[PDB]
Structure 1
Amino acid sequence: MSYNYVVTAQKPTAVNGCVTGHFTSAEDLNLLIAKNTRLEIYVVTAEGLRPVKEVGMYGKIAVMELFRPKGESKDLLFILTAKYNACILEYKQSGESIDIITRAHGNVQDRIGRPSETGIIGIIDPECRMIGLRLYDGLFKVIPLDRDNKELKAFNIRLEELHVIDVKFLYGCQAPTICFVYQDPQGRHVKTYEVSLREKEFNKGPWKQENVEAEASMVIAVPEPFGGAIIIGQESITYHNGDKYLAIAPPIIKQSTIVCHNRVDPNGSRYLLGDMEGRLFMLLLEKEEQMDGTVTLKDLRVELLGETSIAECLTYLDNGVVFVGSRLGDSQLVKLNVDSNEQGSYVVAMETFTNLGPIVDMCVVDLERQGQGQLVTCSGAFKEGSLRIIRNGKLHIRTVPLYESPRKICYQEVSQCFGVLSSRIEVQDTSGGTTALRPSASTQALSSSVSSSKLFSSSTAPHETSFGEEVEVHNLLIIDQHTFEVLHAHQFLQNEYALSLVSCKLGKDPNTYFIVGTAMVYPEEAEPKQGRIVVFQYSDGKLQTVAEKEVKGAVYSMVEFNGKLLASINSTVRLYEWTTEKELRTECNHYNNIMALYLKTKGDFILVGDLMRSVLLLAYKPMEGNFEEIARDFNPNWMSAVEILDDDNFLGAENAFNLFVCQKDSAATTDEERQHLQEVGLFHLGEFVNVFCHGSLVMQNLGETSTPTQGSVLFGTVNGMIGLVTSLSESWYNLLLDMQNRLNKVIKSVGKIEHSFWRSFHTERKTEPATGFIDGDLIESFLDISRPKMQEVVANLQYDDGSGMKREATADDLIKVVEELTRIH
């Protein structure tokens, strides 16, 4: 009875993986880039990047590696999805036609199994004897690369080592051989096995297990002539090859964990390394000759090259050029020079590419023109952190760098400014407290005001701090809406994390306040026992504290409610009145939740989304001054965000990348039955939704009755994807679903994945087909196929044009429908 339409407004921009190779031709150097569901293929030139093809896949790309079987003239591509769809693809070009051919495809799901902690890892041996996949703890899946294995049939080999951190195939082995790091109660170790396809089993590896550093975390497979393996840890770098053992402990790398690597020289003589602070190092292998003509490793050195965006992945191109693929900040093309600059860096940036993800919060404001909505997102992390301002006219994006992590955003029209909660990392100083690693918004304000709050300074046992502990400093920033200058930064109390932010009026008081919900964070506490709601007033260029409320929990969420304050505090939902004396006073409480993380409201009704009990519907009863439990969704879902579609329809998103829609049970004949919400909509989105918000970026057609959709709620994701949810009538739902089925019969799926499988609701507890949701991306894909394919799609299709009787649809009818649909976002 609830029918909804979901469509992508901005595709994900974060890069999850990148590889280079010879995919489009043996002579071409290609770059392939994965942005979750999207695969982009470029040709690498002397000046930069030439786009050649962009495709979507029906899956979250988890592994992407190029390989070239015997007898093939160019690289093939292996892709694995999050739902375990595996495929081998080959690039075929003729004229202006670009096709992704499916050479092989199959589903590699096991009937049972627990996905591993460090996730799916997939690697292909350099001689293409087999593909190896670490999908589940305690199991190693092997796909033999036989010419006949077009279905990617696999077998499992037991792994004695139940907790694998990383694994690689080694180079220079006469039998396929894996090398991996694992953890047990005795510590971490590195071990090898040969993989016998003949025996379908492991055999003893060519070199014995070795002990490694306690935090050894990555394996690099070094090519010939060295062979062997490099093990990267937090404090050390070691090389192993047979009777060869070499370790270094350069102190410079200890400040930040190396998290990615990429080979620079074909012989392994140089590697790039990137750390969590965006520092970029070169690792250089110096050779030693031997009488028998083999080459061995003589020594290892690390050299700091400079700074990049915090890199998820790196690929060296040519001529000193590196592609830096980032998920937390902008991606880049950078140039490496032989000589350093004045500040000692060898790296020079050539080009920067926008990444909007993660979207941690957002709001819609009419910044420039009435009726012209613009989206303002909290984007990024640490030094890459930013605000992003998105407006149409495809899209114009203004970037405001903050150099620290944003968390929440609100708009305050009366002050012509934004409030933004942010956090920065500091490390211990020589003699005192902590010091920041770089300037950021909260340290570069025109003026600043420390939190001198003494709400509970008395009678509060202070908790010690160990010398060496790093600290997070949280701030509320006030930022001008016109200049985007940082007008003010307010620092919160020590160990106090600011979690939620709203701008609103309360009660009968005409002033507008900034209200912040916090938690006091101590390392040994399983859940916070202390927090604050703080009401600030912004006047005369500073925030003055107007009121505080101390609570015994984390204030996860707050929302303005009819001039009152609704707040969620650990396992309680509480309604506060704003008194004549400018204090918060409890009006009423509701207790039957585990953890109320997300609130949205409409009228006197309250929708509470729980971490684990997923959603509950309460009504505040103004004639009783208390809460009433109306209904609950008794199906468990692990929530990440919630939204009220209308008084009767509740939208949820959960951590396994599914959406669902709940309604009251219309066919309920008892109060108890009326208390059960029914999950009437289900859809695998494939993104982790952090936030829904009502609004739209499309020009409003004031008086546009008779359109296919009603309402507009945007949502933001970790990957920088922005989507839109809107409501549909039953007849539109039925028409669009018919269109979906017909599109699914005509569209060539990369890897031959069925749309119904992709969109099917999927958690470790249950798998079910999607219901109640139209895939706007699928509908829009009608517009990029050829006219004859369009004519195929609409053959023998009954369609009601305008108001009247149903008749046969032509391609132009559905072209018009879909074109109209493209303007809703």
Structure 2
Amino acid sequence: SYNYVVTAQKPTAVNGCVTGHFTSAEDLNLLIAKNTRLEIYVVTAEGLRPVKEVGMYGKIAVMELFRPKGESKDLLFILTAKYNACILEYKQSGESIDIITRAHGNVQDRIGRPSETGIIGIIDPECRMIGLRLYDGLFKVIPLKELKAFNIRLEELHVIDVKFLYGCQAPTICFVYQDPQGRHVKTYEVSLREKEFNKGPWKQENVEAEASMVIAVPEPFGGAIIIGQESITYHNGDKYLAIAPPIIKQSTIVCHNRVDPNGSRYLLGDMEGRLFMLLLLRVELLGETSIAECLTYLDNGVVFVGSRLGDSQLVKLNVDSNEQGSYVVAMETFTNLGPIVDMCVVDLERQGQGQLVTCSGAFKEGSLRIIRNGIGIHEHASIDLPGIKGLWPLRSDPNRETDDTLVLSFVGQTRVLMLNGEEVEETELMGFVDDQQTFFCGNVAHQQLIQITSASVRLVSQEPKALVSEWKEPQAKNISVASCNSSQVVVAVGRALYYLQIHPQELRQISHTEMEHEVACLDITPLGDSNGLSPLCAIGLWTDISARILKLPSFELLHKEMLGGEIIPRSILMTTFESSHYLLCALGDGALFYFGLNIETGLLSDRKKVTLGTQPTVLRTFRSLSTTNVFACSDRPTVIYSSNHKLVFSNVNLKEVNYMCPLNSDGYPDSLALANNSTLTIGTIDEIQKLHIRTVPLYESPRKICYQEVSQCFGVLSSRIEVQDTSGGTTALRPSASTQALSSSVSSSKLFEEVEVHNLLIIDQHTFEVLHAHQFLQNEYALSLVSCKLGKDPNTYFIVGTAMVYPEEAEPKQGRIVVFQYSDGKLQTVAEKEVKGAVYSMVEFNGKLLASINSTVRLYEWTTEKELRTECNHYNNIMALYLKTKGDFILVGDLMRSVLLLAYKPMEGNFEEIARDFNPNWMSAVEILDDDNFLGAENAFNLFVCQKTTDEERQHLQEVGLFHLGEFVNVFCHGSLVMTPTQGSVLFGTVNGMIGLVTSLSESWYNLLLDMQNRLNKVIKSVGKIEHSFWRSFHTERKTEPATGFIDGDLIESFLDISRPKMQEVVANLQKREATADDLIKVVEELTRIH
């Protein structure tokens, strides 16, 4: 087996964030770490300015800015989880932006135990060094080219937190540490000139038993602020100030930030999303935010809440409290899918069009996320007008800036609609003809309007509406093709072309030409800083099938591209994306050619072909969020946009669009008028991006998810934290999904401070409303969930596997398997089977129920009497956490990678142990790929693939795939978000909100791409200069082995992004059979279509 792995969605969760002056010493910057990604911004004061996004060959652990003495801007230090260290400088020269490495090296030690409190990366205030706490009993020092490092024997093994002390003659580090006596704060002076530690400026003062963080406070204060569970204490030798506020007792303070540069105010954040102000000691609760991983104070009053459990935020710290009393007000919300704890692919809306519903976030940030490929439209009006052949917006009032008129074209007719606010009405625009089909009309030069029909070119004045000019072909012939801007008109009469200028009360005929063949399409869009006057005319011709760039007024040929074929070009368009000029040309077969266009020479370069639909594509230009795009109307409506000076094509979620135009009226602002075969719809376009994310906040923890088609609803296992009230039970913390159910129910017992309450939610696949919530038993922990049909029975049942969890018990002694029927908007309990353990996993096994009970694996038969009956059992000696199946072939998994394969013998009515493998490593997920292979997630963010004459050979599984992903996979799922080169499709959901895709490749296709990877890596410049081979190397604390049987799709996809001479370099002598760059463009393009 040979597999291909690619990122469908980048990590969303925020790992860290900083503020400084990285770009220029003027611009205030916000650097956000999204694991393998680094987003760089400027504080707009009126928003957030997105400057650059750089990917990396490592997981960011440390990220801290610094300015050592004289510097034009800031230097950034980054340390990866694989101990890759680098200093990065920003470099900008026009539209070309590049992150530059200043120093780099691997700081990892040959020996040592990686510390329990994680990697700690501190920096001296004077920029004299880098302090790293990666291993217990050592303090690594990097004095800030090859990042030369050295260790110091740090006596106190268990360091909680550490910071570099401000205002010190000799650099000092203050650290909270624990020993058998207690937990104490200590100081040490780090000497570079002696390469050792010497006694700190002050005594080892005893701190809180649960002291968690050291906050180095700047001058004139100095010293440190130790934070604990109940207390906040300050130390400066002989200076002490111990405070114990009750307001911070509920939750532990997890993060902080400096508000005043002197150190008078600090932001504090707990695990429950409460925001505090530590004033200089006094603490005041500001308000509620998302559960902050990191906090950042920027500009005046605005705060960045970097959340890993929920959507990240921009919030305002007001001086005056609102009616509720909150000094915190939310401005902007940033979608975070992480953590994806479970997911499923469901054909909601259209069949073939797969959607991904995830169990995202945790606690109050718990949500459902629906991820669908393609941009959507928000319908505000819908009108029955079949057979629209054209759409144009008009401003019938020159004094108004908004479109108040919509002009429609039909077979041989023209209808005019007026927009009186939200009211669309049929009218007749004076001067315009209704008995002729329109090819163009719009607002033109000198407060006039134009209408180009099959018969003439009509020029109408706006005050009053009347015909001021009219142009016709001299032999009264019909206009075949027409193009018009604000000052110019170019019309075709078969082979003839005519160039007109729009003057006051005059349509002036400037020039004319005869073409080699019949004219098919025309475009005279003015590009660049051309004040509504285009010196270029784009033209598509019949028979020769050519795209030609002509000069105005001469009609001189500048360029002639031979598109090739028997299919005539239907639509032609000149456009500008990210200041780069392009020529788009659509053929009658739905194929689209797109070239870059030189405005001066007329040269069409970088020919690229894309298959959009089956029908001829119509290209219309529209504006969205102050950015120019192109709507490609066909049976697969598409938006053509620019991302990193490369054209992107995202699908529209509409069956088909024939024609469209942008409408900006008083009633429909910044809208899109779309037309298909039967109706006209006015609406608003979504975010112009590849995927769309619908958020269904639950305000509790979603754990598991499955889908029942026969019920048109999803089954969701969820849990809510409740506190022990001064009554015989518990009370909620806030309203959540399980509390606010349409219809509620609870489990009836038949089996013998903060509590977790478990529920089975029922959610409608359209509205996403909690139709029903079934609360489980007290102390009953719901683990597994499956929506299937069992035995001879034709009813689909929602089945749940539970465990009775008690603090005294370590391994659940009890559990249930509960069969539910969802009828009449209420769950009816069909069967309740009590088992002697935890039901970690359940799977529908060929009309039977396969379910794990602790170590044992059970097969249940569903009788006519409607109750599960024990068939056969397999006692494993290994916990049956993972239970996956395909036919009579069963996979059994342990959290320690102990896999064993079972087979159900039908005639024997027993289980047979095919093969086993026991190689301890933490395993987070597993999925069967095919008959002989299976995929899994292994410790240190890796992926693996195990495969299947002698018995001591056949009874043993072999590890064929090893790959360092850089992500923690919680779920694998068979499905696709897309409507052959590769075999199969498995999607995966991670902790960081990253979604990925795994597909199989052929032996030679794998070798082709592997060879290509080695060649790409010689061309591609790596951020921080990390070797890709090293990054992808299967890594553990023990061994680091190169990646095997896996292709980095993300690396393969960057071939389409490298320079064209660099593509030539990569493909040169690549291959035995030879490979053209054109062959490799098609192969790589084909692979981008899987996601």
* Secondary structure of 2:1011 counterpart: helix
For residues 1002 and 894 of structure 2, what CA distance do their matches in structure 1 show? 29
Counterparts of residues 699-778 of structure 1 (less than 5 Å): 699=979, 707-778=980-1051
* Secondary structure of 1:173 counterpart: coil
8 Å CA contact 1:67, 1:76 repeated in 2: yes
Q: Which residue of 2 aligns with 1:426?
A: 722
Q: Which residue of 1 aligns with 2:312?
A: 331
8 Å CA contact 2:896, 2:919 repeated in 1: no
For residues 691 and 391 of structure 1, what CA distance do their matches in structure 2 show? 18
How much does 1:233 deviate? 0.7
8 Å CA contact 1:188, 1:211 repeated in 2: yes
How much does 1:111 deviate? 0.9
Q: Which residue of 1 aligns with 2:275?
A: 280
For residues 613 and 37 of structure 1, what CA distance do their matches in structure 2 show? 26
8 Å CA contact 1:609, 1:641 repeated in 2: no
**Once the two structures are superposed, what CA deviation does each residue of 1:417-449 show, in whole Å capped at 9, x if it has no partner?**
111000111112133322111000000011211
Change (3 A) 1:791 1:613: closer
Q: Work out which of the residue numbers 957, 969, 990 in structure 2 matches 1:677.
A: 957
How much does 1:152 deviate? 1.5
**Once the two structures are superposed, what CA deviation does each residue of 1:114-144 show, in whole Å capped at 9, x if it has no partner?**
2111211111111111101110122211112
Counterparts of residues 221-236 of structure 1 (less than 5 Å): 221-236=216-231
How much does 1:624 deviate? 1.5
How much does 1:511 deviate? 1.2
For residues 368 and 487 of structure 1, what CA distance do their matches in structure 2 show? 20
How much does 1:595 deviate? 1.5
How much does 1:71 deviate? 2.4
How much does 1:569 deviate? 1.9
* Secondary structure of 1:26 counterpart: coil
* Secondary structure of 2:1084 counterpart: helix
For residues 521 and 471 of structure 1, what CA distance do their matches in structure 2 show? 11
How much does 1:692 deviate? 0.5
Structure of higher CA gyration radius: 2
For residues 594 and 544 of structure 1, what CA distance do their matches in structure 2 show? 35
Change (3 A) 1:255 1:636: closer
**Once the two structures are superposed, what CA deviation does each residue of 1:649-704 show, in whole Å capped at 9, x if it has no partner?**
1111113211111111xxxx4112211101111111111111111110101xxxxx
8 Å CA contact 1:362, 1:693 repeated in 2: yes
Q: Which residue of 2 aligns with 1:64?
A: 63
For residues 714 and 184 of structure 2, what CA distance do their matches in structure 1 show? 51
* Secondary structure of 2:728 counterpart: coil
For residues 435 and 204 of structure 1, what CA distance do their matches in structure 2 show? 53
8 Å CA contact 1:331, 1:355 repeated in 2: yes
For residues 168 and 47 of structure 1, what CA distance do their matches in structure 2 show? 34
How much does 1:608 deviate? 1.6
After TM superposition, the structure 1 stretch with the greater mean CA deviation from structure 2, 68-77 or 223-232, is 68-77
8 Å CA contact 2:939, 2:1036 repeated in 1: no
How much does 1:512 deviate? 1.2
* Secondary structure of 1:4 counterpart: strand
8 Å CA contact 1:594, 1:613 repeated in 2: no
Q: Work out which of the residue numbers 1060, 1063, 1080 in structure 2 matches 1:814.
A: 1080
Q: Which residue of 1 aligns with 2:76?
A: 77
Q: Where in structure 1 are there 5+ consecutive unaligned residues?
A: 286-299, 456-468, 700-706, 799-805
* Secondary structure of 2:72 counterpart: coil
Q: Which residue of 1 aligns with 2:1057?
A: 784
For residues 118 and 226 of structure 1, what CA distance do their matches in structure 2 show? 28
How much does 1:811 deviate? 3.2
For residues 1027 and 906 of structure 2, what CA distance do their matches in structure 1 show? 50
**Once the two structures are superposed, what CA deviation does each residue of 1:577-633 show, in whole Å capped at 9, x if it has no partner?**
112222222211112242121122111111122212432221112122111111122
How much does 1:157 deviate? 1.2
8 Å CA contact 2:363, 2:699 repeated in 1: yes
8 Å CA contact 1:375, 1:389 repeated in 2: yes
For residues 103 and 856 of structure 2, what CA distance do their matches in structure 1 show? 53
* Secondary structure of 1:442 counterpart: coil
For residues 532 and 141 of structure 1, what CA distance do their matches in structure 2 show? 52
After TM superposition, the structure 1 stretch with the greater mean CA deviation from structure 2, 158-167 or 724-733, is 158-167
8 Å CA contact 2:927, 2:934 repeated in 1: yes
How much does 1:816 deviate? 2.1
* Secondary structure of 1:484 counterpart: coil
Q: Where in structure 2 are there 5+ consecutive unaligned residues?
A: 374-689
**Once the two structures are superposed, what CA deviation does each residue of 1:708-744 show, in whole Å capped at 9, x if it has no partner?**
2111100000000000000000111011001110111
8 Å CA contact 1:87, 1:102 repeated in 2: yes
8 Å CA contact 1:537, 1:546 repeated in 2: yes
User: Is 1:414 the equivalent of 2:710?
Assistant: yes
For residues 543 and 184 of structure 1, what CA distance do their matches in structure 2 show? 54
Over the residues paired in the alignment, what is the CA RMSD in angstroms? 1.2
8 Å CA contact 1:595, 1:612 repeated in 2: no
After TM superposition, the structure 1 stretch with the greater mean CA deviation from structure 2, 538-547 or 309-318, is 538-547
How much does 1:10 deviate? 0.3
8 Å CA contact 2:902, 2:911 repeated in 1: yes
8 Å CA contact 1:427, 1:435 repeated in 2: yes
For residues 404 and 249 of structure 1, what CA distance do their matches in structure 2 show? 31
* Secondary structure of 2:1054 counterpart: helix
How much does 1:750 deviate? 1.1
**Once the two structures are superposed, what CA deviation does each residue of 1:360-418 show, in whole Å capped at 9, x if it has no partner?**
000010010111110000000011100000101x1111100000000000101111111
After TM superposition, the structure 1 stretch with the greater mean CA deviation from structure 2, 788-797 or 174-183, is 788-797
8 Å CA contact 1:593, 1:613 repeated in 2: no
How much does 1:808 deviate? 4.1
8 Å CA contact 1:305, 1:347 repeated in 2: yes
How much does 1:450 deviate? 1.1
Q: Which residue of 1 aligns with 2:372?
A: 391
* Secondary structure of 1:441 counterpart: coil
After TM superposition, the structure 1 stretch with the greater mean CA deviation from structure 2, 783-792 or 313-322, is 783-792
> TM-score w.r.t. structure 2 length?
0.70
8 Å CA contact 1:269, 1:284 repeated in 2: yes
How much does 1:764 deviate? 2.3
8 Å CA contact 1:529, 1:552 repeated in 2: yes
For residues 368 and 862 of structure 2, what CA distance do their matches in structure 1 show? 32
For residues 769 and 755 of structure 1, what CA distance do their matches in structure 2 show? 10
For residues 956 and 306 of structure 2, what CA distance do their matches in structure 1 show? 46
For residues 705 and 307 of structure 2, what CA distance do their matches in structure 1 show? 23
Counterparts of residues 480-491 of structure 1 (less than 5 Å): 480-491=764-775
8 Å CA contact 2:878, 2:898 repeated in 1: no
8 Å CA contact 1:593, 1:610 repeated in 2: no
For residues 755 and 621 of structure 1, what CA distance do their matches in structure 2 show? 46
For residues 1037 and 1046 of structure 2, what CA distance do their matches in structure 1 show? 21
8 Å CA contact 2:7, 2:995 repeated in 1: yes
For residues 150 and 60 of structure 2, what CA distance do their matches in structure 1 show? 22
**Once the two structures are superposed, what CA deviation does each residue of 1:229-262 show, in whole Å capped at 9, x if it has no partner?**
0111111111111211001111011111110000
How much does 1:545 deviate? 1.4
Q: Work out which of the residue numbers 590, 601, 605 in structure 1 matches 2:885.
A: 601
Q: Which residue of 1 aligns with 2:183?
A: 188
For residues 372 and 736 of structure 1, what CA distance do their matches in structure 2 show? 29
After TM superposition, the structure 1 stretch with the greater mean CA deviation from structure 2, 199-208 or 588-597, is 588-597
Percent of aligned pairs sharing the same letter: 100
How much does 1:807 deviate? 5.1
How much does 1:794 deviate? 1.4
* Secondary structure of 2:1007 counterpart: helix
For residues 116 and 109 of structure 2, what CA distance do their matches in structure 1 show? 17
**Once the two structures are superposed, what CA deviation does each residue of 1:741-779 show, in whole Å capped at 9, x if it has no partner?**
011111111111111111111112322111000000000
For residues 537 and 517 of structure 1, what CA distance do their matches in structure 2 show? 15
8 Å CA contact 1:633, 1:679 repeated in 2: no
For residues 594 and 157 of structure 1, what CA distance do their matches in structure 2 show? 43
How much does 1:817 deviate? 1.7
For residues 314 and 375 of structure 1, what CA distance do their matches in structure 2 show? 31
8 Å CA contact 1:89, 1:103 repeated in 2: yes
**Once the two structures are superposed, what CA deviation does each residue of 1:479-533 show, in whole Å capped at 9, x if it has no partner?**
1112111111111111111011111111111111111111111112221111111
* Secondary structure of 1:360 counterpart: strand
Residues matched between the structures, number: 774
For residues 102 and 843 of structure 2, what CA distance do their matches in structure 1 show? 53
> TM-score w.r.t. structure 1 length?
0.92
8 Å CA contact 1:16, 1:35 repeated in 2: yes
How much does 1:206 deviate? 0.7
* Secondary structure of 2:24 counterpart: coil
* Secondary structure of 1:676 counterpart: coil
For residues 822 and 117 of structure 1, what CA distance do their matches in structure 2 show? 41
